[PDB]
Enzyme design. Structure first.
Site, PDB file in Angstrom:
ATOM      1  N   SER A  16    -111.635  22.495   2.455  1.00 31.84           N
ATOM      2  CA  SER A  16    -112.779  23.377   2.251  1.00 31.84           C
ATOM      3  C   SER A  16    -114.083  22.589   2.162  1.00 31.84           C
ATOM      4  CB  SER A  16    -112.563  24.231   0.998  1.00 31.84           C
ATOM      5  OG  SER A  16    -113.215  25.484   1.114  1.00 31.84           O
ATOM      6  N   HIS A  30    -106.056  30.317   2.662  1.00 36.10           N
ATOM      7  CA  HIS A  30    -107.079  29.282   2.606  1.00 36.10           C
ATOM      8  C   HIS A  30    -106.610  28.016   1.900  1.00 36.10           C
ATOM      9  CE1 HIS A  30    -110.992  27.561   2.938  1.00 36.10           C
ATOM     10  NE2 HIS A  30    -111.248  27.590   1.643  1.00 36.10           N
ATOM     11  N   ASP A  52    -107.465  33.173   7.634  1.00 39.03           N
ATOM     12  CA  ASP A  52    -108.147  32.585   6.487  1.00 39.03           C
ATOM     13  C   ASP A  52    -109.319  33.484   6.114  1.00 39.03           C
ATOM     14  OD1 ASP A  52    -109.676  31.029   4.661  1.00 39.03           O
ATOM     15  OD2 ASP A  52    -108.927  29.168   5.541  1.00 39.03           O
TER      16      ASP A  52
END
Ligand SMILES: [Cl-]
Length: 263
Positions: free
Chosen positions: A93, A243, A214
């Site tokens: 991320s 995710h 996602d």
């Protein structure tokens, strides 16, 4: 004192350096399910972002960490204090953009960047589908302020995506471990970021690992990274939903990560 403050861990007997950096809402325990299977070929460096609940919030300087560059400063200072001159870096991320920015500052330091659930910008912009409008992120900030627990219970299962109760439990735990004011401050940093402009300056090879569904990263974002990063890029679709696939589908993440690492 930076190594102790960010809970830096060096584990494994391998000859090459592998850095694992987690995303918002969790800490280095997000890597627990895949960590055993890289200690043979790599010496793994893990650490917690300054915003993690496992880090004493006395370390979080709101003035300093208003920019992602301060997170890059922390990462580079850790690697410098460890005398690491070359490594492969896995960024989940927001840590993926932290790795990209760090590679621009230190072009010789990163041999390869592995971007897991990466996005240069979450806000939509014309035909650019980031996945969110300003009204969406404003609703997130409003939810965190009015009732933090209500926001956590809505964010954790949707971030995990797939019905994996053990992953929801783990991501909920680290989210509830986070101080609410820090969570609001850092979410604004990530949700309102836009690193599209500097992608062309990243020259090291990048491997983009995207899940098939996602909630935080539309598929077009993975292909946007492929077309705009300035070095050799490859995209691979994890055949799973979520995710945080290192928590919800570790076996597939281990398989893909081994391929990208020649291990
Ligand atoms: Cl994040």
């Amino acid at each position: 004192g930076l190594l102790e403050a960010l809970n830096v861990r060096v584990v494994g007997s391998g000859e090459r350096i592998l850095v694992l950096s987690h995303g918002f809402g969790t800490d280095q325990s997000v890597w627990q399910r895949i960590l055993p299977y890289f200690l043979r070929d790599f010496k793994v460096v893990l650490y917690d972002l300054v915003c993690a609940g496992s880090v004493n919030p006395d370390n979080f300087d709101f003035n300093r960490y208003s920019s992602l560059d301060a997170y890059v400063d922390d990462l580079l200072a850790i690697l410098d204090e460890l005398n690491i001159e070359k490594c492969v870096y896995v960024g989940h991320s927001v840590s993926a953009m932290i790795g990209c920015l760090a590679s621009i500052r230190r072009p010789a330091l990163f041999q390869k960047l592995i971007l897991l659930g990466a996005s240069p910008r979450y806000l939509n912009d014309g035909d650019y589908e980031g996945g969110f409008e300003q009204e969406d992120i404003d609703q997130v900030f409003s939810a965190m302020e009015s009732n933090y627990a209500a926001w956590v219970s809505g964010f954790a299962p949707l971030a995990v995506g797939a019905d994996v109760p053990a992953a929801v439990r783990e991501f909920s735990r680290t989210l509830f471990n986070m101080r609410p004011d820090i969570a609001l401050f850092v979410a604004r940093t990530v949700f309102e970021s836009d690193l599209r402009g500097i992608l062309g300056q990243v020259k090291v090879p990048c491997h983009i690992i995207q899940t098939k569904k996602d909630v935080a990263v539309p598929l077009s974002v993975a292909d946007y990274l492929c077309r705009h990063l300035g070095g050799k890029t490859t995209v691979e679709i994890l055949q799973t939903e979520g995710h945080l696939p290192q928590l919800s589908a570790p076996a597939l993440v281990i398989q893909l990560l081994r391929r990208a690492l020649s291990s």
